[PDB]
Design a binder for this molecule. Sequence first.
Ligand SMILES: [K+]
Ligand SMILES: [K+]
Ligand SMILES: [K+]
Ligand SMILES: [K+]
Ligand SMILES: [Mg+2]
Ligand SMILES: [Mg+2]
Ligand SMILES: [Mg+2]
Ligand SMILES: [Mg+2]
Ligand SMILES: [Mg+2]
Ligand SMILES: [Mg+2]
Ligand SMILES: [Mg+2]
Ligand SMILES: [Mg+2]
Ligand SMILES: [Mg+2]
Ligand SMILES: [Zn+2]
Lengths: 82, 150, 202, 44, 68, 220, 129, 98
Amino acid sequence: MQNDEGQNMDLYIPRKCSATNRLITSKDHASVQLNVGHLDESGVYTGQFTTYALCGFIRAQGDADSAMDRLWQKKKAEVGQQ
Amino acid sequence: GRMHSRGKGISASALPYKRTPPSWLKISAPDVEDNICKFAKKGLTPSQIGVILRDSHGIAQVKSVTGSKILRILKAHGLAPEIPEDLYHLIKKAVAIRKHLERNRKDKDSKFRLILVESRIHRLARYYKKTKKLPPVWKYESTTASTLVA
Amino acid sequence: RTLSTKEADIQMMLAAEVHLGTKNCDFQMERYAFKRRNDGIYIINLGKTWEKLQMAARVIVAIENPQDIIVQSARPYGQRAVLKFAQYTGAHAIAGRHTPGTFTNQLQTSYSEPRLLILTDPRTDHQPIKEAALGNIPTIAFCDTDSPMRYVDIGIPANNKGKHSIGVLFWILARMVLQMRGAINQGPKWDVMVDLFFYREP
Amino acid sequence: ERERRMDFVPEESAIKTDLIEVDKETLDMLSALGMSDLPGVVKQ
Amino acid sequence: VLPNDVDLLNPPAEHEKKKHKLKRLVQSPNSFFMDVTTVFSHSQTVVVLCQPTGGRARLIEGCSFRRK
Amino acid sequence: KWVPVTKLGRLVKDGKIRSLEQIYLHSLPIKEFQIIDTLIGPSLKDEVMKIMPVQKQTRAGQRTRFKAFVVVGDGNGHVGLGVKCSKEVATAIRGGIILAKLSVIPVRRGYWGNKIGKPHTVPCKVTGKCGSVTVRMVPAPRGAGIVAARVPKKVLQFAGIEDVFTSSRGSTKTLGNFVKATFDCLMKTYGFLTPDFWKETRFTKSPFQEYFDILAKPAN
Amino acid sequence: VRVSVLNDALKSMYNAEKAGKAQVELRPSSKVIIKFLIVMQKHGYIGDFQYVDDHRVGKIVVELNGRLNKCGVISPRFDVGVATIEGWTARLLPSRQFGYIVLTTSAGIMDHEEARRKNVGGKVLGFFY
Amino acid sequence: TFKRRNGGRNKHGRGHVKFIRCSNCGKCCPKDKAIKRFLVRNIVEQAAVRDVQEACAFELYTLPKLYLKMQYCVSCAIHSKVVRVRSRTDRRVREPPQ
RNA sequence: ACUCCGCCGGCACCUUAUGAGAAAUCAAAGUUUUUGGGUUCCGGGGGGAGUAUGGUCGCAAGGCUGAAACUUAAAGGAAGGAGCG
Ligand SMILES: [K+]
Ligand SMILES: [K+]
Ligand SMILES: [K+]
Ligand SMILES: [K+]
Ligand SMILES: [Mg+2]
Ligand SMILES: [Mg+2]
Ligand SMILES: [Mg+2]
Ligand SMILES: [Mg+2]
Ligand SMILES: [Mg+2]
Ligand SMILES: [Mg+2]
Ligand SMILES: [Mg+2]
Ligand SMILES: [Mg+2]
Ligand SMILES: [Mg+2]
Ligand SMILES: [Zn+2]
């Protein structure tokens, strides 16, 4: 990754699945990146969102729905959303 | 699974996490050991002594009340049988099969099971000799086995 | 007394039998089922159904261009709701049969590259769900108790069979999307009538 | 022919908010949500 | 329940209830004692207060038993 | 000329996207070979690996088709493999070159020991399988060279690998599975989660979300 | 019969990790398993694990964090002097930059990098990376 | 190449099954492999019910039925068209036809 | 006796791949070049050949054990979407 001097030696840093922590390769066309919008006191989209990336492995297993539900039940409690 | 079959059963007792006696159990350790000696003198074995205590006296585990297993209590009073209970029952079964087999020469199923029972006797007898629970020269003899048991 | 936005929707969903599930429950849908009655029918937890509707709406409003959203239904009962859902939310409705190669064959006229995909039943819309997994297309789907969850990112636990259930679900979802845009006033009411989403037999 | 469906809207909605018939299991499902005081919900 | 929708250390008290006595996080017997003179729920002996069976001993309708 | 039919084709045609790594980051399919010619076009270099005739029995005789294996790569971490069957040798080669470009992958490179100079070998032990053929790649010290047969060696050179140890098991004489198995382990170089990838992911907007307005407007 | 409780523990974790589970139960427990986990925990390959007392052998629930590629035993437990550690790493580990071989030495259970620092040999238990 | 998961018969958890004799040719065949059909039809064919019913000597009488259980070997079942060769996909369908 | 929920054990079946495989196919034939839970038997191109010989068992039929000379370039296995092809 980093040379002995410090320069980066990677073409890019692949994303990691938000549920399984697996790397998402360039040909994983079953992987999806999702955005959940943030609301205000009134309940109107404010232009802010939280991003979630899922690998094809977990989506093929059918566990994406439950994984997304748990990841959102925790994140919303941290950013004030509810 | 089973030693001498393909059975894979798991049924067994499940001891509770509480090793102490219940608050409703009032009998003391000296009283329990008095009954254990009383039953042993009547011919009962350690297995069927604990069953009576559980079913008729509310003593789930003797070790919880007395701190020692039933066989250890009997040995301390010189009431432990010369041949261990489990080995005794295997010999009794082998005697029964042989007695049945003498009148039924064509019962090849029994002849097969007799081999399994006697091989089970020799594996257990070997263990008891190593732990010195049997006389060093003790040996199982089909001819004289029926005199030992029963 | 006044009913909150959630109690009103749940009251509306009860009247449409949105909570009545199938006699079989998929193992990945058990988390949404509440209880099974002696009849053998599963009862969907409408409290969680409303929460997933909100989560789905948050994903929809985050799409800058609504034309990138595609909502479709294979069964006739939902062919009317999807058309009305796309009318008010600005999405692109595809009622009827899905043409294979729509999301993969770049040379056919019907080729599309949606950013989001909405479906009425994973079991009947298996083709677009299967084909969306070749183009990094996330999918939202209304899932019954016996629905397969393969390649479904957000599954809304509801009864996607009855004509009233399908119409109400899209009516509520369309309202939530608009309310989150500020286009309409908050609350459980909407000037549009729900009956415009129900199936109109010949 | 859009009027055949669009303009066709009866004076009374097919979804009656009042007099909602529910089962014993459904009532217990609403109790868990704290919504056992809904007006329409009534046992069969 | 899915593996990730459950906590192995704090399972619901109803789930452990229906699990096999040996497969619970901590083994626990399903038997118990009761008054009527204590009697084991799965007694193998004839007390006629209880009749041994393949499982719990069949109690008599007449007398009333209190679990302890 | 080129009239893009995909969103990526338009952005690359417009110039918003200027690197393949921006596409790889979001795992987007590339369906137009003109995209590859616009980003790493001048640095690419194709090479026909083999021409393989295949035959189908028919009532009149045997229909012979030609199967061309083509490998492309800039020698700096990008390699592609394409196979096409066609009735003419020239037609198969031209289509195989197109397929090779469409499958170009990023190849991660690492250091055997000390991180001195540019990366020269694979970062970890990686294996690829196709049919019965398994190709293994072990990191090698600088100057060791590519210790591999001709088919893997050609692919590794186009990927920019300088020094690696290789071993094979199975029917390597099946060139199709040999080259594909080699290409299979090269794409796994970015799948293995090393400790240096443990840092939490910082997501960025996809090209379709960043340039929605440009994509919303029809192109004429 | 159960021959190597360590193999069952590491095999269970490896299968659970590949399936993307967050937790996994190991039964039976042993002080060798606990010390093997601690080596993995110190290098940030597992999260928090908890030992449950059941009055028989105990059980362990291990929290997984998705960083563990593979973990396995080496059976039989060959002797490894300090001079032969280099050969074992060249065989079992992905590269010369990450991955640990766990040894049981007279100084305790430790990874091969710590064994070189203390210049102590022993026997191979397993590996992980 | 293994053609069927059941090996062409219906035997699980047992060693030996006694054979039956084909109703057509008498070939020995294991009972679990033989094609069995239970035929129930009127003892009088439909082409003669009217004549026999007109000649009945009783005001009321139900014509009995003919119960016959037929057990065929594989060769006779195929030759007699009791069963037909099916495609690889259709071989797995075990439900009786319409 | 029947109905509903569940636990342990058994003969199986159905769907599916995140797995494996040359594939057929397999919920084990999976957890294998990211190769190591324990243990027994057993194979090393096709023939000659389960033959000759020696030994051993059997009343016999034969069983068990079991070669070489020589010969040969095959014998053999599976057979835009989908398949390693
Ligand atoms: K038992
Ligand atoms: K048959
Ligand atoms: K069962
Ligand atoms: K074609
Ligand atoms: Mg067992
Ligand atoms: Mg044995
Ligand atoms: Mg054949
Ligand atoms: Mg059986
Ligand atoms: Mg047989
Ligand atoms: Mg199957
Ligand atoms: Mg091996
Ligand atoms: Mg040979
Ligand atoms: Mg094609
Ligand atoms: Zn016949």
